Amino acid sequence: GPEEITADIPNVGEAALSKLDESGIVYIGAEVTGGDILVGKVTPKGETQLTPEEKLLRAIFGEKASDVKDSSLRVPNGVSGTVIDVQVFTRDGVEKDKRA
Amino acid sequence: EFDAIKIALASPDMIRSWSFGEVKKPETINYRTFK
Amino acid sequence: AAFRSVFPIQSYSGNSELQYVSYRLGEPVFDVQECQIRGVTYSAPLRVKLRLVIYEREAPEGTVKDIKEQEVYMGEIPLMTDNGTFVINGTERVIVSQLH
Amino acid sequence: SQLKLLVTRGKEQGYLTYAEVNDHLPEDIVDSDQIEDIIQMINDMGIQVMEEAPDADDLMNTADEDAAEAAAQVLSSVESEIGRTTDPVRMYMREMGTVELLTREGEIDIAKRIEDGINQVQCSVAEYPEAITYLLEQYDRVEAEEARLSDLITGFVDPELAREKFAELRAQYVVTRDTIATAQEEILKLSEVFKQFRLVPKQFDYLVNSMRVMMDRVRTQERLIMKLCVEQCKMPKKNFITLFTGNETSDTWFNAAIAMNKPWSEKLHDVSEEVHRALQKLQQIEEETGLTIEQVKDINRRMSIGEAKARRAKKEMVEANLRLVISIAKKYTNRGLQFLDLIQEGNIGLMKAVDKFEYRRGYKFSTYATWWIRQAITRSIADQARTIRIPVHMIETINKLNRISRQMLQEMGREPTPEELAERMLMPEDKIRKVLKIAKEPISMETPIGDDEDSHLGDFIEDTTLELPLDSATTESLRAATHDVLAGLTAREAKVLRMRFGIDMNTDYTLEEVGKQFDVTRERIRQIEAKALRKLRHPSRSEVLRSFLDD
Amino acid sequence: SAAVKEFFGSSQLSQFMDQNNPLSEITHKRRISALGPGGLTRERAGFEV
Amino acid sequence: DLRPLVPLDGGRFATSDLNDLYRRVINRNNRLKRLLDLAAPDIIVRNEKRMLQEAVDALLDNGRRGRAITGSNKRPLKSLADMIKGKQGRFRQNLLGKR
Numbered sequence: 044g045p046e047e048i049t050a051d052i053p054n055v056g057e058a059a060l061s062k063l064d065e066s067g068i069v070y071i072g073a074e075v076t077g078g079d080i081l082v083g084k085v086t087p088k089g090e091t092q093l094t095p096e097e098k099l100l101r102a103i104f105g106e107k108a109s110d111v112k113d114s115s116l117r118v119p120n121g122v123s124g125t126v127i128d129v130q131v132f133t134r135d136g137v138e139k140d141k142r143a
Numbered sequence: 144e145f146d147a148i149k150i151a152l153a154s155p156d157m158i159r160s161w162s163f164g165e166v167k168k169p170e171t172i173n174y175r176t177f178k
Numbered sequence: 179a180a181f182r183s184v185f186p187i188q189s190y191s192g193n194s195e196l197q198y199v200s201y202r203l204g205e206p207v208f209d210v211q212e213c214q215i216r217g218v219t220y221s222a223p224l225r226v227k228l229r230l231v232i233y234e235r236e237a238p239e240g241t242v243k244d245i246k247e248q249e250v251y252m253g254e255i256p257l258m259t260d261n262g263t264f265v266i267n268g269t270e271r272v273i274v275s276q277l278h
Numbered sequence: 279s280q281l282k283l284l285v286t287r288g289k290e291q292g293y294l295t296y297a298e299v300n301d302h303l304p305e306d307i308v309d310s311d312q313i314e315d316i317i318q319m320i321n322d323m324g325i326q327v328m329e330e331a332p333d334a335d336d337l338m339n340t341a342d343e344d345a346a347e348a349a350a351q352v353l354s355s356v357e358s359e360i361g362r363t364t365d366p367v368r369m370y371m372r373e374m375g376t377v378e379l380l381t382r383e384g385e386i387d388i389a390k391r392i393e394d395g396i397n398q399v400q401c402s403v404a405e406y407p408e409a410i411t412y413l414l415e416q417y418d419r420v421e422a423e424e425a426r427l428s429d430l431i432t433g434f435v436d437p438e439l440a441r442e443k444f445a446e447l448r449a450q451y452v453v454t455r456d457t458i459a460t461a462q463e464e465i466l467k468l469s470e471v472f473k474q475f476r477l478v479p480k481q482f483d484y485l486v487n488s489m490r491v492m493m494d495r496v497r498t499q500e501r502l503i504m505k506l507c508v509e510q511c512k513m514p515k516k517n518f519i520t521l522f523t524g525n526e527t528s529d530t531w532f533n534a535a536i537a538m539n540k541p542w543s544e545k546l547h548d549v550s551e552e553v554h555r556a557l558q559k560l561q562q563i564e565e566e567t568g569l570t571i572e573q574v575k576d577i578n579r580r581m582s583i584g585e586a587k588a589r590r591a592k593k594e595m596v597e598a599n600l601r602l603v604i605s606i607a608k609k610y611t612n613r614g615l616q617f618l619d620l621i622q623e624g625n626i627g628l629m630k631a632v633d634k635f636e637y638r639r640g641y642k643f644s645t646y647a648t649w650w651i652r653q654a655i656t657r658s659i660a661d662q663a664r665t666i667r668i669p670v671h672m673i674e675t676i677n678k679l680n681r682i683s684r685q686m687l688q689e690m691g692r693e694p695t696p697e698e699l700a701e702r703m704l705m706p707e708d709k710i711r712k713v714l715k716i717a718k719e720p721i722s723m724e725t726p727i728g729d730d731e732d733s734h735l736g737d738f739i740e741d742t743t744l745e746l747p748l749d750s751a752t753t754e755s756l757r758a759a760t761h762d763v764l765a766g767l768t769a770r771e772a773k774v775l776r777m778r779f780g781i782d783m784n785t786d787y788t789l790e791e792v793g794k795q796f797d798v799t800r801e802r803i804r805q806i807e808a809k810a811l812r813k814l815r816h817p818s819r820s821e822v823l824r825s826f827l828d829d
Numbered sequence: 830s831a832a833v834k835e836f837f838g839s840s841q842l843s844q845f846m847d848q849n850n851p852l853s854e855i856t857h858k859r860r861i862s863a864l865g866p867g868g869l870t871r872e873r874a875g876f877e878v
Numbered sequence: 879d880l881r882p883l884v885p886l887d888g889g890r891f892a893t894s895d896l897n898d899l900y901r902r903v904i905n906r907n908n909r910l911k912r913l914l915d916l917a918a919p920d921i922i923v924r925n926e927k928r929m930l931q932e933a934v935d936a937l938l939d940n941g942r943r944g945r946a947i948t949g950s951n952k953r954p955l956k957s958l959a960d961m962i963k964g965k966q967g968r969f970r971q972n973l974l975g976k977r
Contacts, residue, residue: 219834219837219838252830253830253831253833253834254830254834255833256833256834256837261854261858262858263846263854263858264837264843266837266838266843267838269845270845270846270848271837271843271844271845271846272843272844272845272846272857272858273837273842273843274842274843274844274857274860274861274862275842275860275861275862276842276861276862276863276864276865276867276868277861277862277863277868277878278867278868
């Protein structure tokens with residue numbers, strides 16, 4: 044299927060998303076550094092077919108392995124700078140998100 | 144673990160033992176569902 | 179001087195000569211900033227006003243009797259910016275002179 | 279042999295140019311590929327033929343040493359020949375050029391040859407009671423609707439007329455068959471009338487190959503009498519021609535073969551068993567196929583004669599047409615299949631044509647065969663042109679796409695957008711994107727990106743299936759942690775937790791198998807599992823565990 | 830268009846304009862290479878040039 | 879997996895030549911089998927045998943004798959020897975010096 048760029052990504056706390064806006068793409072002017080997310084993109088993982096005891100650890104804490112895994116654009120390690128511009132090229136068939 | 148390595152000709156018999164079944168058709172994948 | 183070298187092109191004695199009249203450099207779709215932003219080669223369309231003249235196979239020395247005229251499109255030719263550089267796929271390129 | 283001293287010149291210099299290896303060549307080499315092969319043979323033994331003066335100050339000898347004299351032999355021999363034996367295409371061109379391309383209305387002659395060759399086999403069929411009994415059985419079989427009535431014919435020479443001429447066949451067949459010196463004229467006239475039919479292809483094919491099976495059973499018993507006695511018992515070959523050959527069913531040629539009281543005869547006592555039993559076999563087989571042996575023997579022998587005549591002329595037909603086949607194939611050359619693949623698929627189509635021909639239509643064979651051949655060649659080019667086999671209608675769609683794209687490129691100014699092809703064609707605009715992403719061919723993983731190392735493309739492809747060693751070293755730690763947590767549980771709850779998932783065992787089990795293991799209903803087992811889970815959910819058994827959920 | 834576009838788009842005499850600098854551009858434009866299609870290679874020359 | 883058909887990005891697969899060579903050998907092998915079933919005139923089956931021999935000979939060591947078959951890229955495509963032999967085979971780079 045497709046890949047989204049939404050600002051909701053599995054397996055990362057809200058503290059690591061004070062930079063991304065609602066549409067998924069970082070604010071212009073935010074000071075990022077290595078490991079931050081410049082763009083929040085997830086790709087569908089179907090399906091996991093998980094392990095033994097990992098299954099028990101899932102049952103214990105009632106969580107659900109997400110149907111998606113994340114492949115989001117994070118700053119290469121070492122880099123540290125100011126996002127000074129962001130353009131959004133969109134295919135013609137698609138419909139533009141909020142940021143575009 | 145092991146020792147010397149032998150190289151030699153291979154009979155058709157030894158080759159048929161190496162394999163796991165013969166390849167008859169020349170197609171690779173299924174072009175829409177890529178199984 | 180590249181059109182005269184092959185024009186006019188005659189048939190195999192066919193009493194029909196496709197002769198060149200002139201050409202012109204079109205207007206560039208994108209200017210160099212937009213051409214870098216989109217990843218396009220900055221260039222100009224090349225219109226050519228050929229002309230098919232025909233002679234029917236009687237006389238005298240191919241009577242020009244049934245001729246035509248058009249403006250044909252033969253390819254786009256990249257353009258050198260005001261600093262002598264090209265934009266070939268949004269990337270700046272330079273054609274280094276050769277010593278042959 | 280100036281070549282031979284060219285080699286010594288290249289040696290005593292330590293290198294050869296293209297100038298020298300153009301000087302000391304044979305003056306009669308016109309095919310450049312011969313020059314290619316011989317300069318390769320030279321370099322293979324030394325010395326490498328660079329194109330200029332160098333090696334001037336490069337004093338570096340990997341050209342030793344048995345290859346030297348062998349390669350010199352091959353070079354000294356290349357003048358003895360003229361080639362080529364290296365291009366299959368040219369050797370095939372010569373091969374077809376051997377056969378004179380002159381069958382100018384000899385085609386109809388050889389075609390009539392085929393017709394009256396495949397009717398000697400028709401007669402030999404007409405003398406085979408078993409195939410004709412099959413035809414009668416399947417007449418009464420299909421008219422009873424045991425199959426479609428057309429199961430017997432691909433057309434013939436009326437339903438009730440068909441079935442009742444089959445009825446007259448039945449009556450002529452009974453007057454043929456119960457008149458066991460009366461069968462001669464009846465059987466022969468019934469075969470005369472019978473030869474006016476037109477079988478189903480598979481019908482005739484099966485019946486005649488089972489005719490062959492019948493005669494081959496007779497032939498196998500012939501082996502059993504031949505090698506068992508003449509080649510194993512040392513029976514005299516002249517003897518095997520004398521006594522057995524001619525009678526073949528009575529007991530007067532083998533049982534009167536041991537009895538002939540000779541050095542050969544009274545040694546037949548040890549292979550006497552299988553000949554004794556083979557006589558039983560053949561004697562019952564005479565009636566098994568419907569006639570004594572020698573009759574159907576020589577009828578199928580004439581069958582073989584007729585089929586050989588048929589095939590040997592279709593050869594000349596096929597070659598005289600393949601002279602055309604090559605030409606017809608040459609207009610499909612870049613389409614993805616190398617040339618000799620094309621002409622081979624063409625020749626397959628050509629054999630197809632020659633085995634479906636008719637002079638009756640009064641036309642020229644060329645057009646019919648060329649229709650067959652172009653059809654089969656395009657079938658080939660379709661079915662085996664790409665590394666991923668895309669179907670044929672899809673290739674039609676792709677061709678439409680290419681043509682209309684080239685057209686819009688020179689009519690709509692700049693280029694065709696697929697949104698524009700969605701209108702220019704009557705397609706749904708995701709069919710177009712699909713067919714465009716489907717028609718592209720694969721990139722070769724050895725295509726070199728021109729970098730420093732000259733590494734190719736196939737070395738920049740990560741393996742997105744492997745697990746990172748950190749992840750495996752995690753779940754090993756997870757096995758540790760879960761085993762630890764279970765250790766601090768009652769053996770009931772721990773065994774139920776393990777047996778419920780697949781934790782450190784083979785297959786996980788349903789609740790009922792677990793109750794089996796403990797003699798409880800599955801509800802008891804659900805209670806146990808829920809209590810163990812509730813116990814584990816609390817920290818002090820679950821801090822590290824929940825930390826495995828890193829989020 | 831294909832031939833001229835593969836000249837301009839991919840050939841040894843069409844390079845990324847080195848631009849880390851004003852002088853870098855201005856001295857990459859005024860450059861006289863002796864390689865490329867129609868010119869000798871590295872192996873074949875060689876201390877002639 | 880040693881001659882994979884990995885999916886690159888954009889539905890544009892990448893393969894190694896060995897798939898092309900194995901296709902070329904299996905095609906002519908099957909065609910020869912069908913010729914032998916049809917009882918063809920031995921001219922065509924002779925050409926088919928020679929074609930299959932060139933296929934196997936270009937699969938074993940391409941460019942050895944008969945002007946190596948070139949892939950779709952214009953290029954003389956590699957064979958088992960070229961994955962073994964030469965400066966670029968196994969024995970030289972990944973068998974002596976690795977990342």
